[PDB]
C-alpha cells in the first residue's frame, strides 16, 4: 500500500536515486539504506552507528546519530512523514 512522503524525505529519496511521488514503506527503507551507503554517513568502524547531524538526514530525524540495532528513531520519522 502506497504513501506520499513529505517534502524533506522526498528530496532525500530522490537523492538516493528513487523516482516518483508515492512510495511504499518497503521502497522507502531501501532508498534510506541506499542513501546512507552512498553518503558514507555510517561510522567506518562501528558500521551499525550512523552519524547524520551534518546532513539533511539529521534534521529530518531530529537527531545527530542513531544505531540500526535500535531503529526506533526511524519509526518516529516514518510515522510523521509518510501520509
Amino acid at each position: 500500500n502506497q504513501v506520499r512522503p513529505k517534502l524533506p524525505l522526498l528530496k532525500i529519496l530522490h537523492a538516493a536515486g528513487a523516482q516518483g511521488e508515492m512510495f511504499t514503506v518497503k521502497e522507502v527503507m531501501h532508498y534510506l539504506g541506499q542513501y546512507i551507503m552512498v553518503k558514507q554517513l555510517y561510522d567506518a568502524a562501528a558500521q551499525h552507528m550512523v552519524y547524520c547531524g551534518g546532513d539533511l538526514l539529521g534534521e529530518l530525524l531530529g537527531r545527530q546519530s542513531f544505531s540500526v540495532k535500535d531503529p526506533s528513531p526511524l519509526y518516529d520519522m516514518l510515522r510523521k512523514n509518510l501520509v
Binding site: 514503506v25 518497503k26 527503507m29 531501501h30 539504506g33 546512507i36 551507503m37 555510517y42 558500521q47 551499525h48 540500526v68 540495532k69 531503529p71 526511524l74
Partner: peptide
C-alpha cells in the same frame, strides 16, 4: 560485518 548486512537485519 558491514553496514549493508546490518541494514537488512531490519524488516521493510
Amino acid at each position: 560485518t558491514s553496514f549493508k548486512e546490518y541494514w537488512c537485519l531490519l524488516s521493510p
